[PDB]
Amino acid sequence: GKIEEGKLVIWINGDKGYNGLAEVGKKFEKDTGIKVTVEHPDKLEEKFPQVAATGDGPDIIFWAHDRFGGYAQSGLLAEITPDKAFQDKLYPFTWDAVRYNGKLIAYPIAVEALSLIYNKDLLPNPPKTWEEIPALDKELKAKGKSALMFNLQEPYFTWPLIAADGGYAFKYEYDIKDVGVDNAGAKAGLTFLVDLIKNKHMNADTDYSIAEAAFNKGETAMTINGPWAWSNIDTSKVNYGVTVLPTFKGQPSKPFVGVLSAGINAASPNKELAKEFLENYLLTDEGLEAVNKDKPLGAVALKSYEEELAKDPRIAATMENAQKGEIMPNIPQMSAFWYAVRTAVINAASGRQTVDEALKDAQTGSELYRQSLEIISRYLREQATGAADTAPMGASGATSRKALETLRRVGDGVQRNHETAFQGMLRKLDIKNEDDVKSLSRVMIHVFSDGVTNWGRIVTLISFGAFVAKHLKTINQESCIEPLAESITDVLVRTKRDWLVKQRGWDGFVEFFHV
Ligand SMILES: COc1nn(C)cc1C(=O)N[S@@]1(=O)=NC(=O)c2ccc3c(c2)N(C[C@@H]2CCO[C@H]2[C@](CN2CCN4CCOC[C@@H]4C2)(OC)/C(F)=C/C[C@H](C)C1)C[C@@]1(CCCc2cc(Cl)ccc21)CO3
Ligand SMILES: OC[C@H]1O[C@H](O[C@H]2[C@H](O)[C@@H](O)[C@@H](O)O[C@@H]2CO)[C@H](O)[C@@H](O)[C@@H]1O
Ligand SMILES: [Cl-]
Ligand SMILES: [Cl-]
């Protein structure tokens, strides 16, 4: 498609102050004559990369900063270049959340962290620990109430508990190879949650709407939610407090902290209008107030307005929880991490998998991109140069090593046996440079991904990749090999994610072709 020139289309999630944002849109229109349309489509964070890839979608996309590195890596976002005067009006750490490969890829809006929200008329003093919640629920059940209800369908809400005793996404000291999804800490956290469900203190089917309705109707004493939820609680007239999340095994719950951010679509012909809107209408005291009055933003990036908002105890509590938590990475692998952990929590909560089974799969899913890249990059580069990479494999190194040696055996068999067809494709594709390499993804998707899924055809995908890498070296295009490896890996892990996790990833590969 093609984005329409001379207006702005904005996407923002359905839990945010989109009516307030439209009010800012109307102010923009009054000055400029430019119509601003605000939409809140379902699953917009999944829809955006799909539609933006074809040159379509909104001019401006709002989401937490974690999704934006993936969008930027895919070429879907315009670089943001505000002047010093504007940059200095927002907190430096908020700009850090929207920096990717040394470039700003969005405007930061507000800092979001989950807090414990409690009904003061049911629980005058909230529990300091997760461990006391079962007993509290038993006490409340005798009054026809429950202790706690929160969204169990999105791992964002369960993550603070998983991370408490030592669960982590990607180690920070980031070591992207070091994933902490199936360690003792993560298992302890998720087992506690599953035990709450087993003991009928929570229901595995509880989602955002169910938890919100139960808290706002006075049926449950506590919920876990962000600043955006406070408006509906205000309307309900529940006498509520916002406080520090309970501890688990004596340690703070560690929410993953988000920075609501606004990115500009790389395909937009309205980039100057978008910049003007965001800098001089939205990111002002009046603009943010308009949004905040609809649904609270949390701790805003704009220093001048945050000085007012920081006096609110609910914002103090938000920032207390934020400081105990961690700012989310914006690495492209966050989407896969979230999908992996989402499935794990849901499956463990429903009883479809045990906690061990669930987190094992989540670990495999979260490691999949980087492990696949290590194997594929190494094979392509050693095939092209004739010499192996001496660098340590790192995390899950036996698997990588054994997958690579398996690939050497089976892949060299494919290349030899199918040399003529490989030569025919190589010449027909006519790959000369980094631009021609960029075009191969669509062809790989059409030929590899649409065909039957098995380890044989995965070996062909990679082996032809090695054949191309050899050619690139020969023609003094050795710099194209790593981009090629990244492209093959993306195609493999994106299109065959679910199948790969079912095989136990590269351990399945090694087993399948064992001599
Ligand atoms: C017991 O059985 C086996 N054990 N083991 C170990 C393997 C098999 C086995 O049977 N495997 S197999 O089923 N595999 C495929 O079909 C297959 C799988 C993945 C592929 C892939 C194919 N692709 C086309 C191939 C390349 C050579 O000619 C292709 C061919 C033959 N076709 C026939 C149709 N014609 C139409 C006109 O243009 C030429 C084209 C050539 O694909 C069917 C082929 F030879 C496959 C041989 C495999 C061994 C069969 C390469 C692609 C698309 C091109 C771009 C591109 C770029 C990179 Cl970097 C990387 C990859 C690619 C995607 O990856
Ligand atoms: O549940 C995984 C999900 O978590 C975060 O999404 C949050 C978002 O940051 C909040 O603004 C609010 O909308 O709640 C969401 C959870 O439903 C991540 O930002 C997101 O990428 C991830 O998929
Ligand atoms: Cl128009
Ligand atoms: Cl899949």
Side-chain angles (χ1 to χ4, degrees), residues 318-329:
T318 302
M319 291 313 296
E320 185 181 352
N321 283 306
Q323 287 176 29
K324 292 165 189 286
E326 294 189 332
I327 290 284
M328 285 183 287

Side-chain angles (χ1 to χ4, degrees), residues 370-383 389 404 462 481-482 485-486 489:
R370 195 66 194 74
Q371 185 158 53
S372 298
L373 184 59
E374 200 62 45
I375 293 155
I376 294 167
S377 178
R378 282 179 190 239
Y379 187 58
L380 269 55
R381 287 183 297 104
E382 75 182 25
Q383 287 275 301
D389 190 342
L404 180 55
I462 296 162
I481 291 164
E482 192 62 26
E486 290 161 1
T489 302

Side-chain angles (χ1 to χ4, degrees), residues 13 15-16 63-64 66-67 112 154-156 228 338 342:
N13 203 41
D15 58 6
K16 305 311 197 295
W63 197 263
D66 66 301
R67 297 263 161 187
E112 302 173 352
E154 283 293 343
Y156 185 72
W228 57 85
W338 282 127
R342 177 181 294 114

Side-chain angles (χ1 to χ4, degrees), residues 357-424:
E357 288 166 350
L359 295 174
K360 177 60 176 178
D361 282 352
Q363 185 76 16
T364 300
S366 302
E367 288 175 340
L368 194 55
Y369 177 82
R370 195 66 194 74
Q371 185 158 53
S372 298
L373 184 59
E374 200 62 45
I375 293 155
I376 294 167
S377 178
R378 282 179 190 239
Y379 187 58
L380 269 55
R381 287 183 297 104
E382 75 182 25
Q383 287 275 301
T385 62
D389 190 342
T390 53
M393 286 289 191
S396 305
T399 296
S400 298
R401 181 166 42 74
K402 288 177 175 184
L404 180 55
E405 83 187 338
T406 299
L407 185 56
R408 284 168 186 167
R409 182 160 45 77
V410 187
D412 288 42
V414 173
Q415 294 195 64
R416 180 207 316 169
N417 286 314
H418 301 84
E419 186 164 330
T420 307
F422 274 36
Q423 282 278 340

Side-chain angles (χ1 to χ4, degrees), residues 380 410-411 413-414 418 421-426 428-429 431 440-441 443-449 454-466 468 484 487-488 513:
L380 269 55
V410 187
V414 173
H418 301 84
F422 274 36
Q423 282 278 340
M425 262 299 194
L426 180 66
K428 182 69 182 291
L429 292 160
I431 304 160
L440 297 170
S441 179
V443 184
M444 286 190 286
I445 290 159
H446 186 239
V447 179
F448 164 71
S449 310
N454 55 53
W455 288 118
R457 295 190 73 260
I458 290 165
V459 171
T460 301
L461 171 77
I462 296 162
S463 295
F464 187 70
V468 172
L484 179 66
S487 183
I488 296 159
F513 290 121

